[model samples]
Target: MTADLKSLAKRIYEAYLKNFNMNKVKARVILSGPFVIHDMETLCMAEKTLVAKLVQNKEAEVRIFHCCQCTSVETVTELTEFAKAIPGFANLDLNDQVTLLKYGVYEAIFAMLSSVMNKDGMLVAYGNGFITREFLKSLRKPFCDIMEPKFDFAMKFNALELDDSDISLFVAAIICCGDRPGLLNVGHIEKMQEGIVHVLRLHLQSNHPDDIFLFPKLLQKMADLRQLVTEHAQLVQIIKKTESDAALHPLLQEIYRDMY
Candidate 1:
């Protein structure tokens, strides 16, 4: 949870340093039907509903396509704003911030997938369409593994009953990650990450005083998120070479392109 709006807007500006153009994104959404809402509660509820509509409508025809990967890019774009919203993230060098994002967005996305993930499956959309887990897995080997482990973690992570404020910090920690290889400002990035970890622990301690292990458990999950993304990168590489129709989104491919 951010302390104020001036701080919030400042972090957003910092987060926008090189890669993001918030104004353009807003313009596109306004002209298009992405449909914006202001209320956080309503937005959360709506996201839940969106995921639900995707998961529950088994009878509805579902198609697996490149758009699912496109949806992942969309998720990471919001995560960019979220990372900026963290308390000390604005203190990092703009290039360092972009570097962290380039390397760590998938880890953050997989971490947040706990929000939409279920014991059974996850959600994907392409211009108002949903895909079944069967169809997703039906595609190929490593590609299918992408959503499976996310669902596994999501089932357990959701059981924690963390609110948005709590999850926001969790994601912040993921974005501030510094060990992504070839970081020019590892000290600054790690410091920002430490700031978030402190706030996250304090926030969790105050809110979940009875659950002492929750903090350590969450800390451990950062490592888990890192490992998950590693495997995901492997899956992506294999898919690109083996499956000619894999169809990864440009943003997705771009970020992973230089990761190694």
Candidate 2:
């Protein structure tokens, strides 16, 4: 490593160590069994209570949903743990942290979503459903684009074979982004982002010496995530129009109600 990289890496490791606590992070367990989707048939009979509550203006034919609420919750919890482990992230004022989490949650989710993605398809709701690419496209316009392109990028990203350390640093980079509106300390957040970017670059270099382009590619991926989240917000607006207000999950209604 160059002297510059060595120095940066040393600093980043110090911050990483200070921020990350295994004790604070929850352990993840993988279980066996088929992940069942809430197909139209199942939702009508077996899932009457679930449907009665979640979808009020029940359409005659229920389309395939990822049944991803459980996984989404788990992902959010794990990401919250990972965010706290980032240098300077926990140090941010409470309002700033909430602001960051509110806006940045979608991007972070999109990034982590790639981990379960493959060229052929992706697993949602903790692999409760293996959603095919074509089926994803069959969804509403912007929402369809939201998922399909992510899988495309995920396949390529997975090919890079980044380890856990790289993923953690990348998530930190997303969390500390300074561009989000209503920041209490924009400059400080920017500085945190700078350190994270450098750290991510150094790790990617060390991990994949032969792949010279991986760093920039990852940066582009972050940009793409930004757009995806924006479009996803738009899609949510469409949902509000197409589906009755009561049809939405209460928690989701709470989240998007603020968003739209």
Runs in model 2 deviating more than 4 A are 1-66, 127-129, 138-146, 245-260
Q: lDDT per prediction?
A: 0.62, 0.62
lDDT, candidate 2, at 209: 92
Q: Tell me each candidate's TM-score.
A: 0.70, 0.71
Candidate 1 stretches with Cα past 4 Å from truth are 1-63, 123-135, 138-142
lDDT of 2 by residue, 46-130 (tens): 3343333444443432223323444455555555665775568889898898777777777877776666565656554333344
- Total clashing pairs for each candidate: 0, 1
Top candidate when judged by TM-score against the true structure: 2
Candidate 1 structure quality by residue, lDDT tens digits, 132-228: 4454454445655666677777778878877555666676777777687777888877777777677777778867888889998988888888888
RMSD (Cα, Å) of model 2? 6.0
